[PDB]
Design a protein around this ligand. Structure first.
Ligand SMILES: CCc1c2c(nc3ccc(OC(=O)N4CCC(N5CCCCC5)CC4)cc13)-c1cc3c(c(=O)n1C2)COC(=O)[C@]3(O)CC
Ligand SMILES: CCc1c2c(nc3ccc(OC(=O)N4CCC(N5CCCCC5)CC4)cc13)-c1cc3c(c(=O)n1C2)COC(=O)[C@]3(O)CC
Ligand SMILES: *[C@@H]1O[C@H](CO)[C@@H](O)[C@H](O[C@H]2O[C@@H](C)[C@@H](O)[C@@H](O)[C@@H]2O)[C@H]1NC(C)=O
Ligand SMILES: *[C@@H]1O[C@H](CO)[C@@H](O)[C@H](O[C@H]2O[C@@H](C)[C@@H](O)[C@@H](O)[C@@H]2O)[C@H]1NC(C)=O
Ligand SMILES: *[C@H]1O[C@H](CO)[C@@H](O)[C@H](O[C@H]2O[C@@H](C)[C@@H](O)[C@@H](O)[C@@H]2O)[C@H]1NC(C)=O
Ligand SMILES: *[C@H]1O[C@H](CO)[C@@H](O)[C@H](O[C@H]2O[C@@H](C)[C@@H](O)[C@@H](O)[C@@H]2O)[C@H]1NC(C)=O
Ligand SMILES: *[C@@H]1O[C@H](CO)[C@@H](O)[C@H](O)[C@H]1NC(C)=O
Ligand SMILES: *[C@@H]1O[C@H](CO)[C@@H](O)[C@H](O)[C@H]1NC(C)=O
Lengths: 533, 533
């Protein structure tokens, strides 16, 4: 009964599931913490009290309370990210995918979903771990964590709403995986945590946080970095938004205790409905309740931690996608559409620049504009559009990640940089959107392997290659074949700063990813805004 | 006796001179002002007292007291700009070149030599007007004006050293040409003033100055603009330098009167020897004593005058050369040589950036650096060198001229923009220096016509074309042939902003000359320096 597993918390009943004309085990819904309900809302997670009998882990668990995207109802493109289960605070569970026969001490891979820290679900179709676990014979785990106010409300000082609880949720799952994954054939001394966007930033935060370092071996970061403009706030801003939320809900503000009590009575949807109202600016790619630089989970400022090398030192595989910004412009910028090539005008361009760099003063905006405007042809609808895409991309994902890369590689043990630039043949979004943020995931989890998903043959190869790189890396700390003859994915070094692209064509090696624009975002603009303010 | 001319100041005896196996008249040394000597030093020029008898104008006059370049002794490249006559304060004379037979009421062209306002001579070989006057049958005139302290010392308030006297010198020559050029077959109602570098800036200043507008019809500007960073200073800076000069010469400073008396006793070389010591910065392309925004010669600030359209409205022909900055880097930047391809290092590059933009604060310097550095290959010796060339070029000549162009064309009557990018076949300077500042002059005056100067056949064509454009323009206000079939030199308009290049190849039309870099120099950087200071 490989489906009947006994863990240090209780027994769990699995379920056999088909995968590419075969089967593997699957334990969905394993609880790793007491339900963050009632007075637990906002508090740090508490480990799951051991249970009696057999816990049925055959179906997927609930999804955490979140904002649901309904801008394009009845459109797979955006609906594929929405909660596909019943939302509920009681949502701290994790899913495992064990190969069959159940191996022992095999590479473990824990996935942490993205979603800007305000949304996400471990139960999406696109995150079905059966293919990867099957094809690469690994123990694929998918955790979950609180999001929105629920997971990141921060009244620094209080013990009721300390902030970063959502990250602590991830830590406790990693801890569980630590103590129980061996009972599933997993090797706790060989765990790779990986995630995309907010999930990626999460991985990076676990690398930095002293209280998480010992819970994993190596890590992967997809289109996300711990130092991203949107991935965290100061204790002060965190407290400002928390109060604002309260004001937004007619609450006693006089003290933390009174405010916590008020927010703890409100139904989940009440909080969610006014969640966006706390942001300081009109903007895109900015999220209300995110990790807060607390001095605890994060010893000191992120930048200082990176300089001093105060962070876990291991191997990391990370990269980005060609058009990271397109997805956000569609949702927030003026002029963008899903039903047209969205040629942007000069006036809308100026508008998008503001929404994209909300914290910028007027001179800053000029800087950004000058940097991304071709004055030899500035009324070119196409150009302006691609210009915004790059701005949103470079500022929020690519350059922040590159800064992280360079900074990490000085103390790291092995850095692998990729540039995903393949436009899926069956993508439901229009063409101007290019290689959209988050669309490398379907290849990482190997959906191009499902013949019914009408992908191309060449795309099945890519997905198999990508999973192999991801699997091999988590297993060895290197994605390259021990000694194949296939082109090697070079090691990113401080001097050569090499990286490769990921697509159907033959591998190619490049250097200094968007180095020019990144000098602008990482060195210059920060200085300009500091001096002129 | 076409050589014997009677003017409203006295008679003058000319001299016949050979030109391309033929002859024309030439009156060298016509005095148009009382010698600015003794107590006249620094004062506004006074018209030349009518003389008795026949003034012999067969030889060239003296050159004004100036700093002599002796960085490359015995090298035609730099020596061709040095005074080729005996320097002396008594230097206010002008030269005329009248075709033979002496025509009547023909197009007149007055040349104003450049030299950063600290040097220059109307008697250089490269400025011999016999070819142009001969080939294009025009009355070519070459004036002179005081330079250095002598021509621009400015103690605003005083009447002894009011500043801008040097420009007034040019005005009085233009006035003379006005009242006497008809006696030489010239048409005072058809005078075109043209000059290069400081001379060009001069032309532009005459266009702006209310007291000069009526002295000419149309104008030409070569690699020089009235609004250039180096072409003028505020009344305050003007007074600061004047004092500094005095301090530099152990003078009573207590009052203008005492300081003027002191500077009026010192021999010309004394002043000249400490002339560079007054600049506020360590730098290249910056000159000690230049035009001062006085509220008189210049009603108000240059920028305001250009916005309000407060300036002479006529036709103008102007342009620049491909490598304006090279000449100055050779003389002031670290790393540059005449005996090598001057591949510049990253450290010397940073140094040159400072010398090139002396008025910039640290953030400004960063801006400039980021704008001209290719971070995909920043140790490329070549690139850095060309980068400096462009910086020095764009900041000091090209973008300032472009700003002038755009601003003028809103009220102008006809604007023609050229981009001289032909590298003379016999240039004595090394190749890296490209198309050096001031080397379009030899073609304007048509030296490629002299077979003994070993130019190419193709270069004789260019020189003849160029002179024709220059001549035809001064004659009609349009350089194009009334109705030839040759490619037309389009009119620069605010919308299309067209211009053409000048070289041996077939004409080509372009648009928005260095528009990208100019947005940086004309809009952004000025704003950045304003905000952050
Ligand atoms: C309509 C909901 C919605 C609102 C706001 N911002 C959004 C940003 C992004 C998305 O969608 C994605 O990001 N995407 C959805 C998520 C998707 N992921 C999914 C998982 C993997 C990566 C891709 C990418 C596209 C939806 C948003 C917002 C902002 C503000 C409001 C306000 O009422 N709203 C409502 C009031 O006042 C303010 O001052 C202001 O802060 C600023 C003006
Ligand atoms: C050696 C003389 C010389 C000096 C300085 N600057 C020069 C600039 C340019 C040339 O030559 C050309 O421009 N060129 C010569 C002129 C030529 N024209 C000719 C006509 C048509 C255009 C081309 C172009 C090349 C010669 C220079 C200078 C500067 C300063 C001194 C100081 O002692 N000097 C001496 C002290 O203290 C300061 O703080 C400082 O201001 C800044 C550090
Ligand atoms: C748990 O295992 C059960 C077999 O012992 C299986 O029948 C359950 O499937 C579904 O049953 C229905 C009645 C409902 O309870 C639904 O939630 C279950 O998914 C399976 N699921 C449970 C109850 O956890
Ligand atoms: C003025 O015309 C003279 C003929 O009447 C001619 O001889 C002069 O030539 C040069 O003569 C010598 C002696 C010397 O004065 C020199 O300066 C003259 O150039 C000519 N030049 C003058 C005197 O102005
Ligand atoms: C390839 O699989 C697709 C899965 O999304 C499917 O939509 C395509 O359509 C066909 O299969 C099902 C889903 C149904 O729509 C049927 O009517 C279609 O034949 C499928 N490609 C095709 C056209 O065969
Ligand atoms: C073409 O004219 C040049 C003018 O500068 C000259 O230097 C070249 O040299 C010859 O003429 C004179 C000047 C002298 O140097 C003589 O020895 C040379 O033959 C001249 N080109 C040549 C080489 O004929
Ligand atoms: C990682 O560490 C091992 C041994 O500690 C060392 O041999 C290796 O060079 C390191 N990896 C890199 C390339 O940083
Ligand atoms: C110059 O003025 C004339 C008449 O005043 C006018 O016809 C012409 O269009 C003007 N030139 C331009 C193109 O500005």
């Amino acid at each position: 009964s490989e489906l009947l597993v006994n863990t240090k918390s209780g027994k769990v009943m699995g379920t056999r599931v088909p995968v590419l004309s075969s089967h593997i085990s699957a334990f969905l819904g394993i609880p790793f913490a007491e339900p963050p309900v009632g007075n637990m809302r906002f508090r740090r997670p508490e480990p799951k009290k051991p249970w009696s009998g057999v816990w049925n882990a055959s179906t997927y668990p609930n999804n955490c309370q979140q904002y649901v995207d309904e801008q394009f109802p009845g459109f797979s493109g955006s609906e594929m990210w929405n909660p596909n289960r019943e939302m509920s605070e009681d949502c701290l569970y994790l899913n495992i995918w064990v190969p069959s026969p159940r191996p022992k001490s095999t590479t473990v891979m824990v996935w942490i979903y993205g979603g800007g820290f305000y949304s996400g679900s471990s139960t999406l179709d696109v995150y079905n771990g059966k293919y990867l676990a099957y094809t690469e014979e690994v123990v694929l785990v998918s955790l979950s964590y609180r999001v929105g106010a629920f997971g990141f409300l921060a009244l620094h000082g209080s013990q009721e709403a300390p902030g970063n609880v959502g990250l602590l949720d991830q830590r406790m799952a990693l801890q569980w995986v630590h103590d129980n994954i061996q009972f599933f054939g997993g090797d706790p001394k060989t765990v790779t945590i990986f995630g995309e966007s907010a999930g990626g930033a999460s991985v990076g935060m676990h690398i930095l946080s002293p209280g998480s370092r010992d819970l994993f071996r190596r890590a992967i970061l997809q289109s996300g970095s711990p130092n991203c403009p949107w991935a965290s706030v100061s204790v002060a801003e965190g407290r400002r938004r928390a109060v604002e939320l309260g004001r937004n809900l007619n609450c006693n503000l006089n003290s933390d205790e009174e405010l916590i009590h008020c927010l703890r009575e409100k139904k989940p949807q009440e909080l969610i409905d006014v969640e966006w109202n706390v942001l300081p600016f009109d903007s895109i790619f900015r999220f209300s309740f995110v990790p807060v630089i607390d001095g605890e989970f994060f010893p000191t400022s992120l930048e200082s931690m990176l300089n001093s090398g105060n962070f876990k030192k291991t191997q990391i595989l990370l990269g980005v996608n060609k058009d990271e910004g397109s997805f956000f412009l569609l949702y927030g910028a003026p002029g963008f559409s899903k039903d047209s090539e969205s040629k942007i005008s000069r006036e809308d361009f100026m508008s998008g620049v503001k929404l994209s760099v909300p914290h910028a003063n007027d001179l800053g905006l000029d800087a950004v504009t000058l940097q991304y405007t071709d004055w030899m042809d500035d009324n070119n609808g196409i150009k302006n559009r691609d210009g915004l895409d790059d701005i949103v991309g470079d500022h929020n994902v690519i350059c922040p990640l590159m800064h992280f890369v360079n900074k990490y590689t000085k103390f790291g043990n092995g850095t692998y940089l990729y540039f995903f630039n393949h436009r899926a043949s069956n993508l439901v979004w229009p063409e101007w959107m290019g290689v959209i943020h988050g669309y490398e995931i379907e290849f990482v989890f190997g959906l191009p392997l499902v013949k019914e998903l009408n992908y191309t043959a060449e795309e099945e190869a890519l997905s198999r290659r990508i999973m192999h790189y991801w699997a091999t890396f988590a297993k060895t700390g290197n994605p390259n074949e021990p000694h194949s003859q296939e082109s090697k994915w070079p090691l990113f070094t401080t001097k050569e700063q090499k990286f490769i692209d990921l697509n159907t064509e033959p591998m190619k090696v490049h250097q200094r990813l968007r180095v020019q624009m990144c000098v602008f975002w990482n060195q210059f603009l920060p200085k300009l805004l500091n001096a002129t303010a």
